[PDB]
Design a binder for these strands. Structure first.
Lengths: 215, 120, 48, 114, 122
RNA sequence: UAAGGAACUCGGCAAAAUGACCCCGUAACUUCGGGAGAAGGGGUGCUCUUUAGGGUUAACGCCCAGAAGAGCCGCAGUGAA
RNA sequence: UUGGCACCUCGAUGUCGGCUCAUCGCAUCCUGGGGCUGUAGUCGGUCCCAAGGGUUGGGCUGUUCGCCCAUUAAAGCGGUACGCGAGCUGGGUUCAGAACGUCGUGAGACAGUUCGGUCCCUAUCCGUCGUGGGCGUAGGAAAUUUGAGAGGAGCUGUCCUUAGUACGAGAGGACCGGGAUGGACAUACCUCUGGUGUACCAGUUGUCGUGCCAACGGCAUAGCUGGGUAGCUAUGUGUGGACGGGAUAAGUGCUGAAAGCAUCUAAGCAUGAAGCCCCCCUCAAGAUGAGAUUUCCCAACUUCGGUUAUAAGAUCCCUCAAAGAUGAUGAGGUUAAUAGGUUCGAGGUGGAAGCAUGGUGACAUGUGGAGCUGACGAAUACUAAUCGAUCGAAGACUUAAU
């Protein structure tokens, strides 16, 4: 229930009993292990640090992020584990559980649990105009010459300047987004997937970060 | 796939021409982005040629424009005949490949990256 | 639309801080010949 | 082969008690509607206009003339609310999507058998 | 998806034939209405006789739209034309006889008298 | 380009729609010429028979069919401009 | 607002209304909290606190303004060069044409009507939206972070129960609580419904070609027509804002003197608003105050003037996309599944060619859910990611505990 990391596979649907259609997202969360554990005496705050999926071992002349480097090797070996791709901290959990080196399994969650999902939204390039800010077009007709530009930016004299929050073209892009109060539809322990009701941020095969709902 | 600074029909036209002169000469010199596109057009032709039947000989005639080759001993054959004749028997056991690209320096007039695409 | 004041020597030269070109790849042709551009082939003037 | 995990996790919800049909056939669909305190079966009979999708996401559409008014119903192919499907006749058509029926009327919208 | 300036077809024997919609009731800024919603309209065409004449301003309930509605089990019910029924300020029909099929969503709107008179409710 | 169809706007500006050929039908008014292509309807591919005029011509034949039947195919037959 | 004055601008501060986009005040239109009432109940009237959010589509006019039609919880009043033309329009009016009324002997005029009438500019500086390079942070790196500060969000209707209860002659008809659902707005996504889909499949017209038949190619908007994968999408699918704590406003109080009574106040003690601070979401140590944790690495020469060569770790270069104007980010570089040719699928189309049979023929049937298939899922080193080069540290002083 508390926290887990996974990859986003895609969307499908499921028929709930009483025969209603449920749109669903498939999240695959295998190889979650507890790395270092932080405490208030050493660090000032309580949290656990989890690594998601394992990469290959250290090689002498590696040139990509596929192989671990020496500092990551040492860190992931202090707890008897293999190196991981993604690492995040969870502050909402109880730190007195979770021995270092444990495996966080997918059945820590149960069907019916309310959760929050946090991803990185997906990648829209320089789009700015009426797509970035949901603004109105000018007329397409009678004599217009004003279609997709922004309007006026400010006033005359009094403000001989623009202002600090003015909305102008400049890349939609890939912010961090949390969607609150989704729901777990079904947990699959042999395939190690969770079915979440709805849709979550990001492209396919991106990282998702499920947590128990704060509200 | 990639647009090569041309419209849909100019692109399709010069891509058949590029595929046909590679089968004639076995080796041609062009820019890099064009080579990376004709790479996959030529190998599907060679696949059609290794099948050999009449239905595929007719599918290869939709590409592969129309030229006569004059080999030694005064043999005249078309491009479609040379393909199905010797190009197919050459790579009768490859399972893909059939072409390689080799980079050269930039051209003088423009900065274009020049390339040699050959037929392995 | 038009510049209000002329641009001084110092501001013009600050703006050209990054306007430069860099040295190319330049691997050396071992078996025969002089330097060549890396990942390229020099059939003449080089064994590679 | 959509994606191994997606097909693996949804395979338990595919039905197998369904006859094969294609667009142009006439169907009788026994729908299970839930009134206040009963589960009455109601029949919808029409021509299959289209079939789209794959796996658990598949759907089909049947068209009927009710009281001078055309009506269309779209169902998920594997929904548990359909209790039975029977093929009444096989039509002979020449395309997958019979949208041209929407503008026809009278005895001009008839489908051939065989 | 019925908005202002949309023409509809009347499906009862109250005298009106071809009403035109003036307002979508509901809340401020509301744009469109679908099956089961109430609208304000004006009679554009009528039969001689009848209770409603022409240029009257009346209230109607939408049955039978062309965009259709979606049900929670994931099935859809598109129709072939748009139609409506003139109502009497307590969800009671103004005419006495309803033509054509209506959709089984008026039942969850306390439009029971309209569903009773309909030849087919799907 | 879903659903809607002038709600846009000073103003249907711009765009959309009509459009060739054959058959049928055509108002007020009028200086009796017109209005008029008024409006408003219907038709058109391919094959084989029968007919079959101009008869191209000596002649069916040359050639438009002059026309009626019986068939075949498509979502669509002045199938494009 | 209409004016008074004539201080800046006549070697130009260049325009009413509308459109696009806002931002502030509160003298408050709605929603929140109260006092009085000539407040029985439901509704109201008047005053006090309160600026968080919200505050509509049409008909007529160039119109601001106004009248009217339908809604709504509500359709607030003002400032911003009567906000905004190097952001748009050009209907109106101070341009040349023409006509009517009227005045003038006349040329002409009115500020009276009416029809027509050219809207220039490649952004240097500040400002604003995005995005990189350099150095700094007392050794050099890789990853995970605290949060000083900053931004975002902040709306509201109807129905059902309490209850036909309280009130009331009756008609009518609640407070306070408890449940469902909507409207508008915000932002994430493509399973579903749709749209598009110019290197996907099919039908078809004219003309030219591949010597002819058959089968194909070119041009005619992609020639036209019917479908349509991936991607990108709304009108489609999910989710959010009516919670909780602290301190307050108007107000209500308790105890209580000054002033032997009284009194919310002077000492004290409570309570009390969708407003203030937190709680929720995002950014954030260039926070020069440059923070914290875990792990990795550690040299000699030397005139230590610096020279070398390097370590951990990066980069140049090359194959790419879940990323992108470029750069940056992320997936890979043979000890290899990065492109992706080949093989197999999903999905799309809808029955290939050739041959055989039936028919006088157009055509039909069989072989056979056939053939073809861009972007989506697997497998497979067959082709290309060669050999190489560059950069990169050596842990200072003072004082106090040890």
């Amino acid at each position: 229930t508390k926290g887990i990391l996974g990859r986003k596979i895609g969307m499908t649907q499921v028929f709930g009993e009483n025969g209603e259609l449920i749109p669903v997202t498939v999240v695959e969360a295998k190889e979650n292990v507890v790395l270092q554990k932080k405490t208030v005496e050493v660090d000032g705050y309580n949290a656990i640090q989890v690594g998601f999926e394992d990469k290959k071992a250290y090689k002498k002349d590696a040139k990509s992020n596929k192989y671990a480097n020496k500092p990551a090797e040492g860190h992931a070996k202090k707890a008897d584990a293999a190196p991981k791709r993604f690492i995040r901290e969870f502050r909402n959990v109880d730190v007195d559980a979770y021995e270092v080196g444990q495996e966080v399994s997918v059945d820590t969650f149960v069907a019916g649990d309310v959760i929050d999902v946090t991803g990185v939204s997906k990648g829209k390039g320089f789009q700015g105009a009426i797509k970035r800010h949901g603004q109105s077009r000018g007329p397409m007709s009678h004599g217009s010459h004003f279609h997709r530009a922004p309007g006026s930016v400010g006033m005359a004299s009094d403000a001989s300047r623009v202002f600090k929050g003015q909305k102008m073209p400049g890349r939609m892009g890939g912010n961090t987004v949390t969607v609150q109060n989704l729901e777990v539809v079904q947990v699959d322990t042999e395939n190690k997937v969770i079915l979440v009701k709805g849709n979550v941020p990001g492209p396919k095969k991106g990282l998702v970060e499920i947590r128990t709902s704060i509200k | 796939y990639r647009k090569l600074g041309r419209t849909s029909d100019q692109r399709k036209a010069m891509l058949r021409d590029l595929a046909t002169s590679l089968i004639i000469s076995e080796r041609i010199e062009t820019t890099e982005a064009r080579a990376k596109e004709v790479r996959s057009v030529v190998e599907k032709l060679i696949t059609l040629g290794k099948k050999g039947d009449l239905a595929s000989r007719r599918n290869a005639a939709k590409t592969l424009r129309n030229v006569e080759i004059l080999n030694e001993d005064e043999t005249t054959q078309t491009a479609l005949q040379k393909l199905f004749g010797e190009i197919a028997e050459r790579y009768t056991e490859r399972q893909g490949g059939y072409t390689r690209i080799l980079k050269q320096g930039p051209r003088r007039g423009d900065g274009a990256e020049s390339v040699i695409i050959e037929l392995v | 639309a038009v510049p209000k004041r002329r641009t001084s020597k110092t501001r013009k030269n600050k703006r050209r801080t990054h306007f430069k070109i860099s040295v190319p790849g330049m691997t050396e042709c071992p078996n025969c010949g002089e330097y060549k551009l890396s990942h390229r082939v020099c059939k003449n003037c080089g064994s590679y | 082969t959509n994606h191994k995990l997606i097909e693996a996790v949804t395979k338990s919800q595919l039905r197998t008690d369904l006859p094969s049909f294609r667009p142009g056939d006439t169907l009788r669909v026994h729908v299970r509607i839930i009134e206040g305190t009963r589960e009455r079966i109601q029949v919808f009979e029409g021509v299959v206009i289209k079939r789209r999708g794959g796996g658990v996401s598949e759907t089909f559409t049947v068209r009927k003339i009710s009281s001078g008014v055309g009506v269309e119903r779209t169902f998920p192919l594997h929904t548990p609310k359909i209790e039975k499907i029977e093929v009444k006749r096989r039509g002979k058509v020449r395309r997958a999507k019979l949208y041209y029926l929407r503008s026809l009327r009278g005895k001009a919208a008839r489908i051939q058998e065989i | 998806m019925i908005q202002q300036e949309t023409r509809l077809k009347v499906a009862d024997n109250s005298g009106a034939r071809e009403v035109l919609t003036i307002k979508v009731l509901g809340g401020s800024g509301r744009k469109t209405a679908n099956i089961g919603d109430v609208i304000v309209c004006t009679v554009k065409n009528a039969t001689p006789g009848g209770v409603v004449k022409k240029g009257d301003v009346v209230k109607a309930v939408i049955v039978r739209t062309k965009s259709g509605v979606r049900r929670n089990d994931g099935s859809y019910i598109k129709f072939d034309e748009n139609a409506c029924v003139i109502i009497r300020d307590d969800k009671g029909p103004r005419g006495t006889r309803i033509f054509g099929p209506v959709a089984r969503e008026l039942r969850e709107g306390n439009f029971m008298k309209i569903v009773s008179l309909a030849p087919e409710v799907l």
